[PDB]
Amino acid sequence: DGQAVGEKIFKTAGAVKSYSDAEQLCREAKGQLASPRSSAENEAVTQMVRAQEKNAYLSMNDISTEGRFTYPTGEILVYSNWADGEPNNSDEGQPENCVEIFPDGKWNDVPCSKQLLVICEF
Numbered sequence: 001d002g003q004a005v006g007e008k009i010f011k012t013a014g015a016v017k018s019y020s021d022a023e024q025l026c027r028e029a030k031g032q033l034a035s036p037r038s039s040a041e042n043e044a045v046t047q048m049v050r051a052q053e054k055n056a057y058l059s060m061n062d063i064s065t066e067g068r069f070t071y072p073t074g075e076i077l078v079y080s081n082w083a084d085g086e087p088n089n090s091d092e093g094q095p096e097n098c099v100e101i102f103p104d105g106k107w108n109d110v111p112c113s114k115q116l117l118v119i120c121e122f
């Protein structure tokens with residue numbers, strides 16, 4: 001089961017993984033990491049984060065061009081919900097090229113080595 005908005009379904013099994021491992025899990029399941037493109041999609045992801053009590057990865061990253069967060073298509077964001085002061089590319093100074101979502105629905109850029117809840121979209 002999962003949470004759905006329109007034709008998109010978000011699912012989790014409560015796995016917690018690094019970004020690269022999370023991406024692999026979703027792809028092997030024939031989906032991709034959660035990619036909220038609207039307020040309504042963001043709220044569905046947020047509900048799951050609240051339930052699981054763990055920040056989740058989103059798909060988007062700025063590994064290609066620093067500060068330009070893109071989907072797995074390489075396209076720029078059509079929606080964002082950054083927490084106040086984010087994205088800051090600064091884990092106590094160190095680069096942050098991946099994105100986590102909080103249980104309040106706001107986003108923070110993080111090191112892609114961080115271990116976070118895996119939510120996939122289908």
Ligand SMILES: CC(=O)N[C@@H]1[C@@H](O)[C@H](O)[C@@H](CO)O[C@@H]1O
Pocket residue numbers: 086088090091092096108109110111114
């Ligand atoms: C690894 C991690 O999640 N670090 C976060 C950083 O990303 C965020 O910008 C900062 C805000 O003050 O809090 C923590 O340092």
Ligand SMILES: [Ca+2]
Pocket residue numbers: 062066067089095096097098109
């Ligand atoms: Ca960055």
Ligand SMILES: [Ca+2]
Pocket residue numbers: 086087088089090091096108109110
């Ligand atoms: Ca940050």
